[PDB]
Amino acid sequence: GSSGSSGKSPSGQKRSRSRSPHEAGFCVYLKGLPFEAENKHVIDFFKKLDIVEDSIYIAYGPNGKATGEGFVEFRNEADYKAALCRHKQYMGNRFIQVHPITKKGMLEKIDMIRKRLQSGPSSG
């Protein structure tokens, strides 16, 4: 194991908390994804694991470009814990951060994000 050297490029400088303890499966919040990110990229990151190809959700900008945010849900638990052990990693040539998120909270965002891509006079 060569210690070598690497670079540090933090982003967001923000944290998340929980108001009340509620039930929730195993999900992961990825930040830093590339502009051309794709379900494949999300998998290549947490390879050798059981990820619901369906669950794998990625936020896309209004210009047809990945904003740099994704979400994954590991069916099993033992496989979920490992996902967290894969922090401070670089997606090939990009840098992404791994942070645990509650299913419920995970959808919360996915909802607000869609409201940005959805085009309609209806509030929701």
Side-chain angles (χ1 to χ4, degrees), residues 16-77:
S16 73
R17 40 164 208 290
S18 63
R19 202 184 278 86
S20 276
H22 60 52
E23 206 163 45
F26 306 105
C27 285
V28 280
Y29 181 20
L30 290 160
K31 303 177 89 209
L33 286 168
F35 285 77
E36 294 282 297
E38 284 190 271
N39 314 116
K40 63 180 88 197
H41 286 92
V42 187
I43 302 158
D44 182 75
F45 189 88
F46 296 120
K47 290 210 305 270
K48 280 287 197 66
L49 299 160
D50 270 81
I51 305 176
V52 193
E53 272 209 39
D54 294 85
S55 69
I56 308 198
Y57 191 106
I58 297 168
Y60 298 125
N63 318 78
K65 287 282 200 178
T67 79
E69 306 170 325
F71 308 107
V72 162
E73 169 172 72
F74 304 108
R75 270 278 185 276
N76 306 307
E77 171 197 69

